[PDB]
């Protein structure tokens, strides 16, 4: 039987701690939601045997086996993890950039979290501090919209390419720019009032993050409606051009838009969000299906072309990964079929992207064959974390 087979794999009686260290090794976290029952059993008890063991691991056997038979998308997780630490310390040195002077804390924070498509977790630095999604949320509400309404409908209102405000057919160029994000906001969960629409998006972000940290920054929501002249301008221009769905309260939508920009996450929780996008719309730490593959494909496409503001082409060329930056200092990054990530560092460059975060993404792809158009079979001197030795 599997838990016998596995009992031998890990033994030659078993000391409990010695099984925990074995597990964390595979990349998994003790807290893993899919590992609940097993941890519940172990928490009813310090030295297992085939009967005691089988008793606990029974309910989560398929997963535990796949982790211990090194069948995760990244077999040598410990090795891959120390490279990430190298990349982190390397990007730490880069001390350029200005903080959003309108943000107001320390320019000495920096964090990276990884969540594989298999649930494997890693962090370095300030990964547990909450910060604001800002523009990092634009791909998310877009996914939500398409998930609920579908490509066809959603792109009656917004465009699908890069760049003024309005494209050929008088739609905002795409939903990664404010004009387009504002429109997309007006499509989500119509009819109900804003408070309820908001509760709904928060619920959706919760599934996306496997229920890890998602919060809200009223401080930020106030600064946004505060300095939102530019955004109000766009709003009226959109109203005038009849860009919204019938029966829309435009001033209402802007207010909604600002709340969404003030949603909080951490490197860790966000990395899980990113991971769901890596993973076909399935949240990798709960196994729950959150987004239609169609919403995920569309989101990854437009992140690719339009995710790093003015720097999107340079980025697509040298990095080749769907990412999305935001003004609080985040870079949501997705490596399809492998992992999702969240990089956070307050100081931005001219173009509005986290300086350290940009340094990190470049280094990452220069190291491993994660570039969209890297070949998995011949890739020169890069390394492939997906392979054993």
């Amino acid at each position: 039987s599997l838990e016998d087979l596995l009992f031998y794999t890990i033994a030659e009686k078993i000391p409990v701690h010695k099984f925990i260290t074995a597990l964390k090794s595979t990349g998994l976290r003790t807290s893993d939601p899919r590992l609940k029952e097993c941890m519940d059993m172990l928490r009813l008890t310090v030295m297992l045997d085939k009967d005691l063991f089988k008793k606990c691991v029974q309910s989560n056997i398929v997963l535990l086996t796949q982790a211990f038979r090194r069948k995760f998308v990244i077999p040598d997780f410990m090795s891959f993890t120390s490279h990430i630490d190298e990349l982190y310390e390397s990007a730490k040195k880069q001390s350029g950039g200005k903080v959003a002077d309108y943000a107001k804390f320390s320019p000495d924070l920096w964090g990276v979290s990884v969540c594989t498509a298999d649930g494997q977790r890693h962090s370095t630095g300030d990964t547990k501090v909450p910060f604001c999604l800002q523009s990092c949320v634009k791909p998310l509400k877009y996914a939500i919209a398409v998930n609920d309404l579908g490509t066809e409908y959603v792109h009656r209102y917004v465009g699908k390419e890069p760049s003024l405000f309005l494209n050929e057919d008088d739609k905002p160029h795409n939903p990664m720019v404010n004009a387009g994000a504002i429109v997309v906001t007006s499509l989500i969960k119509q009819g109900v009032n804003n408070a309820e629409k908001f509760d709904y998006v928060m619920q959706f972000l919760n599934k996306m993050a496997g229920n890890e940290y998602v919060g809200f920054s009223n401080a930020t929501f106030q600064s946004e409606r505060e300095s939102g002249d530019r955004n109000f301008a766009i709003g009226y221009y959109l109203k005038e051009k009849k860009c919204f769905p019938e029966g829309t309260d435009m001033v209402g939508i802007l207010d909604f838009y600002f709340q969404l920009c003030s949603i909080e996450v951490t490197c860790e929780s966000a990395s899980v969000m990113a991971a769901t996008l890596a993973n076909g719309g399935f949240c990798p730490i709960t196994g729950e299906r959150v987004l239609s593959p169609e919403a995920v494909r569309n989101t990854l496409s437009l992140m690719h072309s339009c995710g790093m503001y003015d720097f999107s082409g340079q980025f697509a060329f040298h990095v080749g990964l769907p990412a999305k930056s935001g003004v609080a200092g985040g870079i949501l990054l997705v490596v399809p079929n492998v992992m999702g990530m969240m990089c956070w560092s307050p100081p931005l460059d001219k173009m509005g992207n986290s300086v350290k975060g940009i340094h990190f993404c470049h280094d990452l792809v220069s190291l491993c064959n994660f570039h969209n158009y890297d070949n998995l079979r011949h890739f020169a001197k890069k390394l492939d974390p997906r392979r054993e030795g």
Copy 2:
């Protein structure tokens, strides 16, 4: 023993006819003419029943590969079913009879062909895949790969930009190598110093390598037609000369002539499909096993195909198809599906934006069907089918 084990798997009882072994091999998708199969095929022709021993004698040579092929470890294992899908898509697009043909081309509006060469050498064609047509702008990715391979990204991009689009961008570089201006600057970096005839032979050599040595030709008829309406290109040429866009000591009128030549290069669906596959395959020609391009050159070529490869229709195309491709005014669409296969679709009648009507139809169809989109998931892909899997 490896050729024993395989003898047992194909032998049902202690002698195999030669036609039965041949017929089992064909279905795996390989052609008998496969270059990595030459010795084996020689040995066989030099003889009608093999025993464990007379068979060992004919397969030992290319055994690693004969194994992977019979043990269905190819990139598309059930190649026969995948192939019937290609034919359905082909027939589906054969119906779409829109579009106007280029009028500078004197070709049948009812020519239409598709060829596939997988990253492993598996072949399939259907329709007019043997006729030769000119690459035209389809050549742009190829010669850009050649440039970056001989000179390296850094140098080649001192002279040409790397992004979509008044002819020149901010740094007074043409926008990217997939537009005429960019293509003319790239043309000027290849094989510097030596004369045109040689630069040309040199590229043709390189194309032959990429095509695994199948048909690469040349159409003087077209090359003359090109130089007799290259008013817009001469303009570009003079403007670039003025903005100091070429390397030192470039003869611009000569580069323009070299560039008309390259557009006039000929291929067939089948040979082009092999070229596409070399690009799909990290630089190795998949039917010769030979390294042709630095993977750095292949990544770049692909990047720019995805973003500026379909003329004004690139954005729509990248969103809906998500595959690097390049079209040309002759009716050709070079298509690459990274890690899987290369393709070439040829149908002369173009739509409004300069792309083959049928080739375009076919490309959307292909991705509706299989999870080949750049941003499809290999685990969860809803209703699409994965030709890389078994059940």
Copy 3:
């Protein structure tokens, strides 16, 4: 004696009837209601035959001008013939029945009127010149003149540009005061500090001066309509607020409301024609003799009318007509012929570019006929006729 000499020139033998003197005066183009003629007309009404003495008693007052008028030293001396030409042009354009009316306006497609006031006070109208319509964008030159007159070119152009055309130019100033953005910034410089009702009264005062005190009104109907579709203007308003385009401590939503108000101001062809003439006349209202505008303000207003006054049609218009003008969505075209006269043409139906169809027709016609083009020659003007001359 001056009033003797003139008595002799109009007296044919030693007593003049009053109706004969009146009838001779009318033909010179003056109206009896002329403000610089008031005392003379009072004296006359206070009385039917004048002798050398009872006439001296009624003309001494405004004698300088009565002289210039009877001695044909006006800017257009044979005013009666010039007037019949205006009517021909009027009738010529009355035939042109193209164009759509603004649908935000509920006016007869068959309303059409033209008024003339020369730099000397000579008046002529024909068609519906008594009906009141809204200035709309026709007000833009006026309030820009007011700005530059109260504040001076240098200041006013710290806030708005001075050239034809993404809303903002290089220096992040609206392009020019004749487009909505420019107009909204200008609106924000006038009468700073005090409240809107007063700023408004203040402008109306200034318009009354410019119109020699003839009809300036206001349409609340329109002002309400304007504020109920000012989505595009509120957008401009927010964008300007963001780019720090206003002076210190401007209330933007209030400026936008003030600006809708100014668009809703009412005039008639006749009163507007006097305004136009003040602009034609270096700033002096030609029927009151009163200075209303610095000539520095008048030159600028005119410069910008010539270059950005006819919406997207300014370049064509300046080439073919060569006269500063401004149109508005109500159907009005403020026209100035420097040193000669001002005009106002009103016909509600607009063409594709936002200009009155008949007003446009009429303006080209006018310059076909007379050498009034900015760049016609006063000596050699081929087949055109000069209304400033005698034979």
Copy 4:
């Protein structure tokens, strides 16, 4: 009789010199072509009397009277002339600018010539040196074209407004830019070969300048075909777009275009050209009709909008006069109904206009009410040279 009346006007016997000084005073030049016979008579002879006088002045009486009865467009010419000298010395101080590094002489040359619509002449500085028209010729060949073919026809090929190369209807924006000047060149005198076309334009420029200096700089013609890559580029682009008239040799037209750019003039002769444009198409020193009023109106219009390159709007706003600058350092300037001018000074500004020349044009209009939209009746503190005291 007129020459009696005039004899008294100038006497109370007449010493010949004393009549010459009297004449030059009115603004006229002794060499005046319309004063030929009179000067011929005086040159058959030193102390006239009514018989002797009448004898000489008879043939040119109408003109001489109009000059001596101060009936010229500028009555107080001597006064107006010293202001011009003020303006000249004022602009002389301004020592910025770079010379066309591709031109190659002294950045210390500077000249202004005036020719009134009445023949009155004045110069200061280097007004007798020949320099190249360069772009200053663009309005001239345009006038020629329209004179011979008419507005309707000529604007089938070129535009009439400011700005890439091609406008809405695929015509160059206007003939003051190279693309448009090249087209206009292809319209002039078709059929005949270039040498003959050129002879014809030279003939036309001769009438325009009252037969004053017009020459040709082969040195310049060679530098032009030399560095003409940009121009060749435009040529092919124009060929491709079918912008030329049927049966045109495009490479031929470019060569023609370069010759025209190498035509020489002086401040003095050019000022006469400008004067013909001021004067309705009549050459003011010969009385000859050279250009249709239609060609003159059109030329003045497009000089107004497009004559000073990028600086055309600034210029139109602050100066209000039709002008046209050229890269050798000329500014052809026209004050309609009054005078024509030529300002020359090698050093250019960023935009390509003579620095001193720009200084001069601004000062000129700030002084006198010559601005297009100045009022001749109320004009504040400017002076009106057209009026007596």
